[PDB]
Amino acid sequence: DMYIERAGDITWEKDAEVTGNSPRLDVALDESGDFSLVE
Amino acid sequence: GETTDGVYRVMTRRLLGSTQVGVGVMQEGVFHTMWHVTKGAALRSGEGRLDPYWGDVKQDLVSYCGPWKLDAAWDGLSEVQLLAVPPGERAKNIQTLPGIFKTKDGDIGAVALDYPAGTSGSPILDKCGRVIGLYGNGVVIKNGSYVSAITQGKRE
Ligand SMILES: COc1cc(Cc2ccnc(N3CCNCC3)c2)nc(N2CCNCC2)n1
C-alpha cells in the first residue's frame, strides 16, 4: 500500500533560484498519454 | 487521515527501503497527482485511506476523495515556479519561463527542468501561488535532457 507524507506549503517564494530555458517543440500525444517528439 | 492543504510525497514500502514513486497536491480535501505515479491505486495517510474519484490515462491525471479542484492556468507570458519535491531531498522552488508544446489539439506550456522521475507530480505555481499544472509528463529532446509539460485538469 502506497502512502502520502506532507513535504511543504504551496507558496510562491520571492528571491528563488532562476534556471531553465523556454523551448518551442512540435509534439504528439497518444491514447496512452505518452508525448512523442514530432519532426 | 491528515487532509491539510499543501504538497505531499507519494511513497512505497513494496521495494528495498521506502522508495518515493511521485509527488501530489492536497487542495479543498482532494489529493491531486499524475496517474503514472499511483496507477489509479488507493493510497494511505496515517491510518486513513485515500480512494480514487476520477482519473484519465491520456491526461495522466487522477484525483482522490473528490473531483479535480485545481483550475488556474499559465498566462503564456509570465515566469512560473516549479515547487519541486525531490526524493530524499527538501522541497525547493525553482523559477523558470515556460516553453511551448505545439500539438494538433492546441499549445500547452512546458518546463525544461530535469529531476529524478520520483519528482513526478510536483506543482507548477503562478505569482499568487495558485496551482496551474503538474510536472512529470513530457518528452526527451535531442539534447538527451527532459522537457515536461504543464499538465492541468478540468474543474466542474
Ligand atoms: C523519458 O520518459 C520519462 C517519463 C517519466 C514519467 C513516466 C514514466 C513512465 N511512464 C510514464 N507514462 C505516462 C504517460 N504515458 C504512460 C506512461 C511516465 N519521467 C521521466 N523522467 C526522467 C528523469 N527526468 C524527469 C523524470 N522520463
Structural determination approach: X-ray
Please pick, among B36, B63, B122, B148, the residue that the annotation labels catalytic: B36
Q: Which residues pair with B100 in a beta bridge?
A: A24, B109
Resolution of the model in angstroms: 2.3
Residues of chain A in contact with residue B43, where contact means CB-CB under 8 angstroms, are 1-4
| Contacts for B93 with CB less than 8 Å, ≥ 6 apart | A12, A13, A16, A17, B81, B82, B83, B84, B125
Q: Max CA-CA distance within chain A?
A: 41
Q: Minimal Cα distance from B4: which residue of A?
A: A6
Q: Which residues line ligand 1 (CB under 6 A)?
A: A 32-34; B 36, 60, 114-115, 117, 120, 136-137, 140, 146
Options 2.130.10.10, 3.20.20.70, 3.40.50.2300, 2.40.10.120; which CATH number does B6-64 get? 2.40.10.120
Query: Residue ranges per domain, chain B?
Result: 6-64, 80-149
Contact A19, B113 (CB under 8 A): yes
Residues of chain B in contact with residue A3, where contact means CB-CB under 8 angstroms, are 10-13, 43-45
Q: Which CATH class is domain B80-149?
A: mainly beta
Cα(B94)–Cα(A26) distance, integer angstroms: 25
| Contacts for B89 with CB less than 8 Å, ≥ 6 apart | none
Q: Which grid coordinates belong to B31?
A: 489529493
B60 is catalytic: yes
